[PDB]
């Protein structure tokens, strides 16, 4: 005698006004590698978008152009190890998000959905992320 939408409205009606607690979730659930790689894909994605936006704002507000700031950094004569670490930190989120994005596109085709295949594809993404980042940073 109650439709599904009426039952949903009654659910939130009597639960939000009651004294019932909300059972814990994020602070108690056991983590896994595919789960930890899901939030990392979102974290790198947002970090890359905020980096493009900051670079876009710098082009509109900085008094100098891009070739000037390159010479400023090149004149400081930084150590090759520090230059390698800076290049690695910039290419790592792009590399991880790119490979795991390909991993998402394969999923969108309906392939590799077995739990053991999900673990294999995730490990493949991790090693390709390290190899691609280390090679590009070594240039």
């Amino acid at each position: 005698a109650t439709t599904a939408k009426e039952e949903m409205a009654r659910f939130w009606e009597k639960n939000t006004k009651s004294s019932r607690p909300l059972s814990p979730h994020i602070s108690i659930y056991k983590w896994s590698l595919p789960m930890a790689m899901s939030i990392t894909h979102r974290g790198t994605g947002v970090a890359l978008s905020l980096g493009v936006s900051l670079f876009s704002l710098a082009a509109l507000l900085l008094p100098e152009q891009f070739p000037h700031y390159v010479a400023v950094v090149k004149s400081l004569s930084l150590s090759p190890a520090l230059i390698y670490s800076a290049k690695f930190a910039l290419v790592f989120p792009l590399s991880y998000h790119t490979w795991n994005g390909i991993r998402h596109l394969v999923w969108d085709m309906g392939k590799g959905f077995k739990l053991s295949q999900v673990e294999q594809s995730g490990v493949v993404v991790l090693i390709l992320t390290l190899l691609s980042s280390a090679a590009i940073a070594a240039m």
């Binding site: 979102r42 994605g45 978008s49 493009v52 704002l57 509109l60 152009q65 390159v70 950094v73």
Partner: protein, 102 residues
């Protein structure tokens, strides 16, 4: 029309694949065509991506409209600045090569 949800999902995957194809194109054929293509792909892919984050974590009629309105402003200024950099400066493909030559 009546399939607005599925068409938006398909357009997201198409832009992701397009943006994926621009990465080797920027290294093999750097130039203005790839510079402005990256400007359009990075803005659209990032705008739709941050919209999914807002849809998941922002709730309430007023907070949703405020977050989505600010995302349009953020994406509009982002695409405008990238197009400014490609026309008045060295462009995206050249800026990366200059940064890696440090």
């Amino acid at each position: 029309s009546s399939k607005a949800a599925s068409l938006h999902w398909t357009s997201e995957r198409a832009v992701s694949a397009l943006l994926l194809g621009l990465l080797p194109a920027a290294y093999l054929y750097p130039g203005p065509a790839v510079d402005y293509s990256l400007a359009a792909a990075l803005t659209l892919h990032g705008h739709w991506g941050l919209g999914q984050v807002i849809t998941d974590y922002v709730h309430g009629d007023t907070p949703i409209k405020v977050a989505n309105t600010g995302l349009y402003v953020l994406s509009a200024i982002t695409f405008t600045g990238l197009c400014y950099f490609n026309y008045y400066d060295v462009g995206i493909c050249k800026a990366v090569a200059m940064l890696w030559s440090i």
